[PDB]
Amino acid sequence: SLKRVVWALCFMGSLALLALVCTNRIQYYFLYPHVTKLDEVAATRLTFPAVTFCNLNEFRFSRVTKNDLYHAGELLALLNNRYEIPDTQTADEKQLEILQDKANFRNFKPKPFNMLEFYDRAGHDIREMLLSCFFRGEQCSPEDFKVVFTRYGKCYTFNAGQDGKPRLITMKGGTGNGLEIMLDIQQDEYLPVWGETDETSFEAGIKVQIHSQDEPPLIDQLGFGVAPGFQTFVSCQEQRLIYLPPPWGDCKATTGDDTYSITACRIDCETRYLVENCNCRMVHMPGDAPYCTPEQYKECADPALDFLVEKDNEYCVCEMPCNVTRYGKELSMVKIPSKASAKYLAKKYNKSEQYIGENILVLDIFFEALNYETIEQKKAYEVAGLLGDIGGQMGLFIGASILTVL
Amino acid sequence: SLKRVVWALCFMGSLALLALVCTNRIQYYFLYPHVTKLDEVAATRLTFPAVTFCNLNEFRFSRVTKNDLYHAGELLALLNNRYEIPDTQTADEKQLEILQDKANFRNFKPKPFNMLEFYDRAGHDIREMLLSCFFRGEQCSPEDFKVVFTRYGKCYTFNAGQDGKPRLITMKGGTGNGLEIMLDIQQDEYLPVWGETDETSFEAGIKVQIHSQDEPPLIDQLGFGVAPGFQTFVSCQEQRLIYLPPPWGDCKATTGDDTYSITACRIDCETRYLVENCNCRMVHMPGDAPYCTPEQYKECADPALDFLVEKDNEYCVCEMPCNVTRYGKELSMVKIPSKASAKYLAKKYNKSEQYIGENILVLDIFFEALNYETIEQKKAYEVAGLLGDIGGQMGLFIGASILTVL
Amino acid sequence: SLKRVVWALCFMGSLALLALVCTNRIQYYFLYPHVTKLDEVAATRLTFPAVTFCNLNEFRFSRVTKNDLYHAGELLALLNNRYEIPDTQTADEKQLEILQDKANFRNFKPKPFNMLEFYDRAGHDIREMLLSCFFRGEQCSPEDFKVVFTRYGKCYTFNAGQDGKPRLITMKGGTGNGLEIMLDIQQDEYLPVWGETDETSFEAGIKVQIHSQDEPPLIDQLGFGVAPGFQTFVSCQEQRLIYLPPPWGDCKATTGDDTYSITACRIDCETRYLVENCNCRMVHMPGDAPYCTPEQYKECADPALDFLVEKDNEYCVCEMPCNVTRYGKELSMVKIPSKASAKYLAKKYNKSEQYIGENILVLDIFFEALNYETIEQKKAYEVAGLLGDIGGQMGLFIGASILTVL
Amino acid sequence: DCIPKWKGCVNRDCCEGLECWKRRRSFEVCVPKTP
Amino acid sequence: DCIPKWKGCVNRDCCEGLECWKRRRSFEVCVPKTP
Amino acid sequence: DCIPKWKGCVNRDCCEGLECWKRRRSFEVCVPKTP
Numbered sequence A, B, C: 001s002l003k004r005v006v007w008a009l010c011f012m013g014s015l016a017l018l019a020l021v022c023t024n025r026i027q028y029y030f031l032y033p034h035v036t037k038l039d040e041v042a043a044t045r046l047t048f049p050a051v052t053f054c055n056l057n058e059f060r061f062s063r064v065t066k067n068d069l070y071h072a073g074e075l076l077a078l079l080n081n082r083y084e085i086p087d088t089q090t091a092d093e094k095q096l097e098i099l100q101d102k103a104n105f106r107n108f109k110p111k112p113f114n115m116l117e118f119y120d121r122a123g124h125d126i127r128e129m130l131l132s133c134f135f136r137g138e139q140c141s142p143e144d145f146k147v148v149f150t151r152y153g154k155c156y157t158f159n160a161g162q163d164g165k166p167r168l169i170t171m172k173g174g175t176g177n178g179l180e181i182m183l184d185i186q187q188d189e190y191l192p193v194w195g196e197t198d199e200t201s202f203e204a205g206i207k208v209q210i211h212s213q214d215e216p217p218l219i220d221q222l223g224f225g226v227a228p229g230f231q232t233f234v235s236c237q238e239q240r241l242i243y244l245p246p247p248w249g250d251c252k253a254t255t256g257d258d259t260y261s262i263t264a265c266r267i268d269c270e271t272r273y274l275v276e277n278c279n280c281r282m283v284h285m286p287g288d289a290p291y292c293t294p295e296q297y298k299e300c301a302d303p304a305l306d307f308l309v310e311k312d313n314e315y316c317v318c319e320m321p322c323n324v325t326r327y328g329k330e331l332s333m334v335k336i337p338s339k340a341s342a343k344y345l346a347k348k349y350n351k352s353e354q355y356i357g358e359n360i361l362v363l364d365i366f367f368e369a370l371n372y373e374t375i376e377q378k379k380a381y382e383v384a385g386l387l388g389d390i391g392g393q394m395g396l397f398i399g400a401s402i403l404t405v406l
Numbered sequence D, E, F: 001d002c003i004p005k006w007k008g009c010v011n012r013d014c015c016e017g018l019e020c021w022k023r024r025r026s027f028e029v030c031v032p033k034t035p
C-alpha cells in the first residue's frame, strides 16, 4: 500500500506542521514581542524647550543684613560656633569694615527669618542679571522667566508654559530662530568662601538645563555649565522616544502623579525623605510641610539630602516613563569681549574693562535643523496579527473538521 | 444537509478571507508605506568634510583708508550723521591720532568704492592668519582654502572640492588623520566698536562650519564658535541620512537648482528678497545683480535681511531634501600657550606674551572612527511585493474562475 | 478542450510559482542577509567606563637632574649638537641660574639611565596632582588609578578593572553618581619649550579618554582636552553596538590577541613596526623588546612613529570588531575659581591667587540617564527560516511527488 | 510724517502697515506688521 | 558618647548603625552604614 | 652624500627612495616616498 501510505503520510503531515507552526506563532504572541521604530521627521514647527538657568552664587552680599548673618551665617561658613570669623577667614580689603559693621553682635537684637524669603530677596535678580534677551528676533524681557527654586537658589525658567502661558515654537533652524541671552553673572555680589559647605562654591558662572516643560529641572544633577567671558552656542537636536507598559514593556504611563517624569518622581522622593528624616521640607521642595532652618539645614536637611542622592540607592526606585523627550546639544565658546568692544561695554553697563571679562556671558540656544527624531516601541504581534496568521487557517481547519466526522 | 451546508460554508468562507485579505494588502500598498533602514558601516575611507571658518572682525583697521571711512564709516558706527565721532566714542590711546589723520574731512576729495572689493582688501587675510596647517600629516598652506563671502566678511573654505579640485579622504580615525590649524585671530587689526550695528561685534574669535562640499555655508546661522587661547579638538561622526519623494515621502530630489541643499535654497531666498526689496544684492550673495552701498546697506539691505531671517516665516518655504549629510561633533579646549611655551611663541611669531594668549588659537578637526552611519527611507510595499502576495493568488483565483463556469 | 486546458493551465502554473518563489527565498538566504536591531534599554545599573587622563607636560623640571639632561637634553630641544643652549633659548628669570648649575659639563661624569624609569620618576605624580577625588559620593584616592604609559608620559587610568580589581557601577544618572576630580596641572613643574619637538608642547592642561576597560587608551589620537581654570562637566550616553562575522558581516570576533580592540590591534602594529624599523621598542609599548634611547628616539623611534600613523596607510589594516562600546559625551566649562573662592583656595593649597587660575581644573564625568542604547546586526534569514518558508512546502511538494508517479 | 519700511525708527511714527522693531545686533527700525 | 545621624563627625564616634563619611562639597558627618 | 631614512633633513639630499617631510610637532626628516 505504498501510494496508499503516502496518501495518509502527507495528509497526516499537513496537520503536523499546521498545528505545529500555528502554536508556534501563537507562542510568539505570548512572549508579547515588540519592535523599536526609529523615525526622522522634519516639520516646519518645533516647540521650543524650557530653559532653566541658575547662578552659582546662592545670594548677593549686597543684599544680606545683620539679621540673616546671625541665623544663616554659620551655614555659609562665614561664622564660628561662637558667631565669629575663623582663622580660615580669607576676605577682601574693603569687605572687613563692611562685614563687621554688619557683624557686630554687641547689643544684638534678633528678628525672625525664613529661607524661602531669604532666597527670594538675597538670591540673584534676573532684572539685574539680564542685559538682553531675544527669542527668534523678538525682544523678550524679565517678564518671560518664571521663578523656580532649586538647590542653587532663586532660579529662572525660560519658555515655562506654566501659569497657563503658551509654549513658544520655532519656524526655522539656526541662530536667529533660537534664544539669545546676555548676562552679568554679578561676581561683585558673590558671597565670600571661607570654607567648604553645600551653600558655598569654588566656581563662577551659571548652570543651565534644557527640559520639556512637562519636566521640572534638577539642575544640580542634569544641568550643563556656562562660563562668563564667552559667547556659548548650544545647538540642539530634538530626540523624542517612546516606551510601552507591560506585558510588552517596563514603562509607566501615569498622569496620576500632571505628567510623569523621572526628575518628577525623583524630586518628591527627596521631599518625602527630607520631610520624614528631618521633620522639615527644604525651600525648593514642594508640599504643604514646614521650611527648614539654618540649624535644621546644617544638622539634618543638608547632610540627609547628600546621603540620599549620592549614597543610598535602595530607597528610591523611580520607574521608566513611556513618553520621554531629550534634547541633544552641541556647545562652543568664543571670547567676549573682543578687545575691541571692551571699552564699549565698560561704558554701556558702567563697569570696568577688567570687570566685563569676568562677569559677562552670552548664551545662544537654537536648533540646527527643523528635523527632530523619534524612537518608538511598537507592538510586534497583536491579537489582530495572530488572528491574521493562525486564526484564518484555524477557522479553515475547524471547517474541515465537520466534513470529516461524516 | 449539515455536511452539505459545511461544504459550502467553508467554501464560501475561503473566497471571503481571500478577497478580504487580498484587498487589505492591496490597500496597504495604497498608503505608500515606508520603513527607515538604519545602518552603521565602517569603511577604510572617509571623504573629509569641507570646513569653512570666518573671523569675527569684518575688516582690519590697518587696512582701511580715508576713502572707505567716508562711505562705510557710518555703517560701522564709527561716524555721525555729521561724519563725526559720537560722545559714545570709546577708543584706544594711540587710535586717536591715527584715526583722525585718517578722519580729516577738511579739504576732502572723495573717490569711488564697492563693498565687494572692500571686503576683499580690508577683510582678514588667510596668508596672515594661518600660522600652520596640516591635513593627515602632510603640510598644507593658504593655497588650499577657497574664498567664500559670507555675512561675516572675507571667509575661507577648506577641503572645497570646488574649482574642480579633489575632495580629500581619510584612512584612519583620530587626530593625525584630520586637519589641524593654528591661527592668529589678529585682534590688533580689529575695528573699534563705538556702538551696536550688524557689522560690529562684541566677541573675539572665529566661527567654523563643517559641511558637505555639496552644501554652502550659512555660518551666520549654522556655525559653531572657536575661541582664541585654546586648543580645540572637534571630533566628528559622519551621519548620512536619506528620504523619498512622494507619494512615499516629502523630500525633493532636485539637481535643477548643482545639488539641492537647504542652505542652498535658503540662500537665494535671501538673494531674491534682498534684490527685490532693496533693488540691490548683498556682496556675499550670488547672481548678476548690483552690489549694495553703505547707504543701501544701512537703510535697506541690512534691516530687510534681518526681518527676513528672524521675523517673517511665511515667505520662504524650503522643501525637505532627500539626500542629506550631517556631521555630529564633540568639542573640547585646552589652554594655549602653556605658561612654558609662551615665550617660545612670543619669539617665533614676534608678538608679546600677553598678545599670544589673546590672539592665538589651534583648531583640530578629525573623525573618532572610520565608521559612519546612515538612516534610509526605503519603500515598504512595492508593486513587486503586491504581485508577490495578492498577485500570485489572484492569478490562481482567476484560474479556478474558468473551471467553475463549467 | 477549454476547461481541460485550464485544468492543466493553473495546475502547471502552481508548480511554476512554487519552485519560482521557493528558489527565490532560497536565493535570498544565499545573500546571507542581515538586519540592524536598534534598542534603547534603561537599566538600574551601568558599569562605569575606564577614564584615562594624561598631563600634557611629559616631565617635571623640579624632578630632572644633571644626569638625564645629558642624554635627554637634546630630545627636549633644551640642548645643541654641542650640548648647549640655542640662540632660540627662551627661559625664565630664575631658571637660568638653576638651569646651568644643572647644565655645567665642566668636569662631567655621566651615569646610565632608561626612559622607562625616567618617565616613571620625572613624569607627573598623581599623588601631587590630585587634590580631590569622588566617585558616587564615596571619597576615592590615588590608590584607585592604575598607571598606563602613553606617548604623553606617566598617565593614570581610573576605573581600571585591571590587576583583577572590580569595575564600578552607577545606580543613577546625574552628577553625584559619577566621578568628580580636582587637579593641579602643576604648570610650575612644566619643562621649558625652546623649540618644537614631539616631547615638547604649546598647550597646558590634560587630555582624557573614556574607554571600556576592555579597550586600552590611545590618548594621542582618541582623547579629548580639558583646560585648567574651568569646571568641566562631561555627560555621557552609553551606546553599545554589535557586528557579525562573515558571510553575514565583516567583523572579527577574536579573543586570540584578551579581547580584540581597534586601539588594541592599532597599538601592537606600532609595536611591531617601531621594533622592526628602529631595532627598539618605545616605553609605552608592550612586549619583551629593548627600550629606546634619546639618540634612538630622535634619530629613529620618534620620526618612524610619526610616518607610521600620519603618512603610511598601506601597512596597518586593523579589522572591524564585532563587540564594540562607545561613549557619547557632552562637555561644558565654568570658571573656577570664582573670584570669591580664589583666596580660599590660595590658602588651602598654599599657592598664589594668580596661580590657582592657571593650574586648577575640576573634571566631572557622569551619565545623563541610566538608559543606554544598542545597535545590533542580527541574521535576517537563517537555516531555520528557509526550512520555515520553502522547506515545509518543499516537503509537501515532495509528498505529492510519489502519489503522482502512480 | 510717517516713516517708511527699512528706515531707522530710533526715538519713535512708522508708515502705514509697519511696526518699529528693535533688532538684535543693531538699532530699531520700521518693518512689516507681524502675526 | 555616641554621635547621632545627621551630626558633624569632624575630628572623629558615631551612634550605633552609622559610619562617619566625608561629603563632597562639605564637612564629614555620621550617616547609615552602607553595603 | 645621501641622507638615510629616519634622519633629520633640516636645511636640505635624502637617500634613494625617500622624501624629506616636515612633521607636525617637530623638525623635518627623510622618510619613504608616498603615493
Ligand SMILES: *[C@@H]1O[C@H](CO)[C@@H](O)[C@H](O)[C@H]1NC(C)=O
Binding pocket: A253, A323
Ligand atoms: C505620548 O506621546 C504622544 C505624542 O505627543 C502624545 O500624543 C501622547 O499623549 C503620549 N502618550 C500618553 C498616553 O500620554
Ligand SMILES: *[C@@H]1O[C@H](CO)[C@@H](O)[C@H](O)[C@H]1NC(C)=O
Binding pocket: A350, A351
Ligand atoms: C557707574 O559705575 C560706578 C561703579 O560701579 C558706580 O559708582 C556709579 O554709580 C555708576 N553709575 C553712575 C555714574 O551713577
Ligand SMILES: *[C@@H]1O[C@H](CO)[C@@H](O)[C@H](O)[C@H]1NC(C)=O
Binding pocket: B253, B323
Ligand atoms: C543619494 O545618495 C547616494 C549615495 O551617495 C547617491 O549615489 C545618489 O546619487 C543620491 N541620490 C540622488 C538621486 O541624487
Ligand SMILES: *[C@@H]1O[C@H](CO)[C@@H](O)[C@H](O)[C@H]1NC(C)=O
Binding pocket: B350, B351
Ligand atoms: C617684531 O614685532 C614688533 C611688534 O609687532 C614689530 O615692530 C617688528 O617689526 C617685528 N619684527 C621686526 C624685528 O621687524
Ligand SMILES: *[C@@H]1O[C@H](CO)[C@@H](O)[C@H](O)[C@H]1NC(C)=O
Binding pocket: C253, C323
Ligand atoms: C558581545 O557582547 C555580549 C554582551 O556583553 C557578550 O555577552 C558577548 O560575550 C560578546 N560576544 C562575544 C562573542 O564575545
Ligand SMILES: *[C@@H]1O[C@H](CO)[C@@H](O)[C@H](O)[C@H]1NC(C)=O
Binding pocket: C350, C351
Ligand atoms: C607655601 O607656599 C610657598 C610657595 O610655594 C612655599 O614656599 C611653602 O613651602 C609653602 N608651605 C609652607 C608654609 O611651608
